[PDB]
Amino acid sequence: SLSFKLKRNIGYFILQTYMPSILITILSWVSFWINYDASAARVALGITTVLT
Amino acid sequence: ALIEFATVNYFTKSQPARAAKIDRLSRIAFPLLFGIFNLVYWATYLNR
Numbered sequence: 001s002l003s004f005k006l007k008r009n010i011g012y013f014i015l016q017t018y019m020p021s022i023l024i025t026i027l028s029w030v031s032f033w034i035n036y037d038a039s040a041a042r043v044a045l046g047i048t049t050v051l052t
Numbered sequence: 053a054l055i056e057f058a059t060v061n062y063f064t065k066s067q068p069a070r071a072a073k074i075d076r077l078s079r080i081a082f083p084l085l086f087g088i089f090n091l092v093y094w095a096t097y098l099n100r
């Protein structure tokens with residue numbers, strides 16, 4: 001038996017899937033700084049974030 | 053740009069002068085910074 005122990009590099013996944021979702025969550029948080037009198041804006045933020 | 057808009061909206065109806073000033077400054081700063089970055093990037097990556 002010849003065996004290999006492979007450790008997966010993570011940088012690609014940081015560039016591809018982790019950073020985008022973090023940024024999308026920050027975007028979601030932006031909603032709380034918009035006056036709660038505006039409905040279209042906040043719902044736009046939330047729905048767009050969910051779909052993204 | 054989005055955070056700048058959020059700040060402007062936050063300061064609107066409380067300090068309209070500040071919001072207008074920051075919007076006016078951004079209208080110039082953002083394009084100029086983007087153009088400078090593009091120039092630097094293309095210069096440093098087209099000459100290697």
Ligand SMILES: *[C@@H]1O[C@H](CO)[C@@H](O[C@@H]2O[C@H](CO)[C@@H](O[C@@H]3O[C@H](CO[C@H]4O[C@H](CO)[C@@H](O)[C@H](O)[C@@H]4O)[C@@H](O)[C@H](O[C@H]4O[C@H](CO)[C@@H](O)[C@H](O)[C@@H]4O)[C@@H]3O)[C@H](O)[C@H]2NC(C)=O)[C@H](O)[C@H]1NC(C)=O
Binds near residue numbers: 003004005
């Ligand atoms: C990747 O995946 C593979 C597959 O699982 C791993 O391969 C295993 O490697 C380990 C060690 O590297 C193997 O274990 C070895 O077994 C030998 C034979 O075992 C006999 O003796 C034991 C009791 O000691 C009985 O229970 C068994 O039934 C056999 O009769 C041992 O001789 C080896 O050394 C042991 O004894 C010496 C005595 O001096 C000690 O110094 C050692 O520390 C150790 O205790 C060792 O135990 C195992 O069998 C392999 N798997 C298979 C399926 O065979 C790879 O290790 C893993 N990692 C990598 C990097 O590839």
